[PDB]
Scaffold this active site. Sequence first.
Site, PDB file in Angstrom:
ATOM      1  N   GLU A 237      40.277  43.473  37.707  1.00 41.91           N
ATOM      2  CA  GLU A 237      39.341  43.493  36.591  1.00 41.91           C
ATOM      3  C   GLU A 237      38.980  42.058  36.263  1.00 41.91           C
ATOM      4  O   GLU A 237      39.796  41.302  35.723  1.00 41.91           O
ATOM      5  CB  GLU A 237      39.930  44.143  35.331  1.00 41.91           C
ATOM      6  CG  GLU A 237      38.877  44.305  34.209  1.00 41.91           C
ATOM      7  CD  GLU A 237      39.416  43.986  32.830  1.00 41.91           C
ATOM      8  OE1 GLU A 237      40.532  43.440  32.744  1.00 41.91           O
ATOM      9  OE2 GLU A 237      38.710  44.228  31.823  1.00 41.91           O
TER      10      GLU A 237
ATOM     11  N   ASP B 103      44.853  44.562  35.869  1.00 39.05           N
ATOM     12  CA  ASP B 103      44.320  44.329  34.529  1.00 39.05           C
ATOM     13  C   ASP B 103      44.265  42.855  34.172  1.00 39.05           C
ATOM     14  O   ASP B 103      45.146  42.082  34.551  1.00 39.05           O
ATOM     15  CB  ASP B 103      45.186  45.062  33.499  1.00 39.05           C
ATOM     16  CG  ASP B 103      44.727  44.830  32.069  1.00 39.05           C
ATOM     17  OD1 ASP B 103      43.645  45.333  31.704  1.00 39.05           O
ATOM     18  OD2 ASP B 103      45.451  44.145  31.317  1.00 39.05           O
TER      19      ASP B 103
END
Length: 496
Positions: free
Chosen positions: A233, A197
């Site tokens: 990401e 993330d």
Amino acid sequence: QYSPNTQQGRTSIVHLFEWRWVDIALECERYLAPKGFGGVQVSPPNENVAIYNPFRPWWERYQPVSYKLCTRSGNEDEFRNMVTRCNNVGVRIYVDAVINHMCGNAVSAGTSSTCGSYFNPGSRDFPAVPYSGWDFNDGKCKTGSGDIENYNDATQVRDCRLTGLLDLALEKDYVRSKIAEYMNHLIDIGVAGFRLDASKHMWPGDIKAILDKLHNLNSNWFPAGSKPFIYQEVIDLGGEPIKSSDYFGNGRVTEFKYGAKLGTVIRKWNGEKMSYLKNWGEGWGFVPSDRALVFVDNHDNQRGHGAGGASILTFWDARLYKMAVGFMLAHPYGFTRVMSSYRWPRQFQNGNDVNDWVGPPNNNGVIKEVTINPDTTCGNDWVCEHRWRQIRNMVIFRNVVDGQPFTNWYDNGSNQVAFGRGNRGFIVFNNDDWSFSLTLQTGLPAGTYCDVISGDKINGNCTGIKIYVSDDGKAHFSISNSAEDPFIAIHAESKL
Ligand SMILES: C[C@H]1O[C@H](O[C@H]2[C@H](O)[C@@H](O)[C@@H](O)O[C@@H]2CO)[C@H](O)[C@@H](O)[C@@H]1N[C@H]1C=C(CO)[C@@H](O)[C@H](O)[C@H]1O
Ligand SMILES: *[C@@H]1O[C@H](CO)[C@@H](O)[C@H](O)[C@H]1NC(C)=O
Ligand SMILES: [Ca+2]
Ligand SMILES: [Cl-]
């Protein structure tokens, strides 16, 4: 870290956004395995801040308090039980790792956390880890607000706070070790990989140092020397100094240009048309296929919280969404991720949804269980796109044609295109305002095929449309612009 340790023959993963651990374990056995799904991306399994204003938003799970496996999805025992059962049926688990930061710097100190752990943002005190003021980038960030103010400055994007989220000093061995401790605990439990993330907000070299401390997958389920699958990401639509290619040395990257462009093409915005998809993939400036994780929408942009704009297609636009997902699952570019979400009360005001914060279906904050209806659909406001016949059958389609080349492409110069995957599958699309009726070369062997979009192949028969392939591989296709699903797909396993 580029390969998905998925079982041979399974080529997709599904994001069961906000699903409870017990529901995922069941779904692995009753559906995912039988239908050929390769894996499941789960929501952050570590303790987070409990936010009551707004009431338990989906985004509270991206504000870590500790690394204890205790959230609204379940406790550690329930998490382990899920990984074990899923792995025992050939379905892998991928964890959403929030390692760039902890919770908001303005969050009130106390025990308002999913497991009662104490934490104090103001004093940078997170005893459950433990972390202290010495473990954050407060002294490293050079902006006046202490938060990220300009994405054109690659340094503050990494060293400063993303919307107020306390930024961990990932250059410190101590911090790298606590994160590795957490990730290794998950790997030893049986996880096959991680979604890193906010990777754009971490230096590539820091990520690498952490990955170097990771164990090889659990030898009870995977072969020796198996490395966890890593997909970072990184939202790179161009225009910024940070490039997704800077992260290739760590693993795969999310290709957000993919869903954004597919959205404009299918919506036919600003003169675009499906005929331009002839050179889809690297031809459109996308990252190398072997480094890409693709999807139509993700938990962020489906509610307008990520990047992609209003072009992003979601379950709300069912008809076009199924077509976008179908094109994706049929095309060889990248590793595919299917979205699975819940319904929330979308309330648009001046172009924006005021309820984009609403969390999963719940009763007094307790997430509702995923109920299954007699028609295999879900209840309790869970959309279950992965259960839609059209999407599920295309997931199988990708498995069947895995490895076959892109061939026999056809387009009418507008929005009616078709292409095949070797001699194992063929798919046709009609997105124009008129009917399509032409005989095309499929490359498939002679026989009668069941259209897997309008129906299924059950006990020697098709429940929907049937296609007849001649000895020379030609077949007639008829698709009205008024059809529920304006596309047809047939493959080796739907043949009578
Ligand atoms: C929420 C999202 O914010 C950032 O994304 C920005 C892009 O990087 C910019 O280039 C531009 O497009 O604006 C975007 C914001 O609209 C950030 O980089 C992303 O990583 C972030 N998304 C993930 C991070 C979170 C924080 O833990 C979560 O809130 C979210 O669910 C994640 O998907
Ligand atoms: C297929 O369906 C038809 C009726 O539509 C039936 O006559 C036939 O027996 C079925 N085939 C098999 C193999 O069951
Ligand atoms: Ca950072
Ligand atoms: Cl993502």
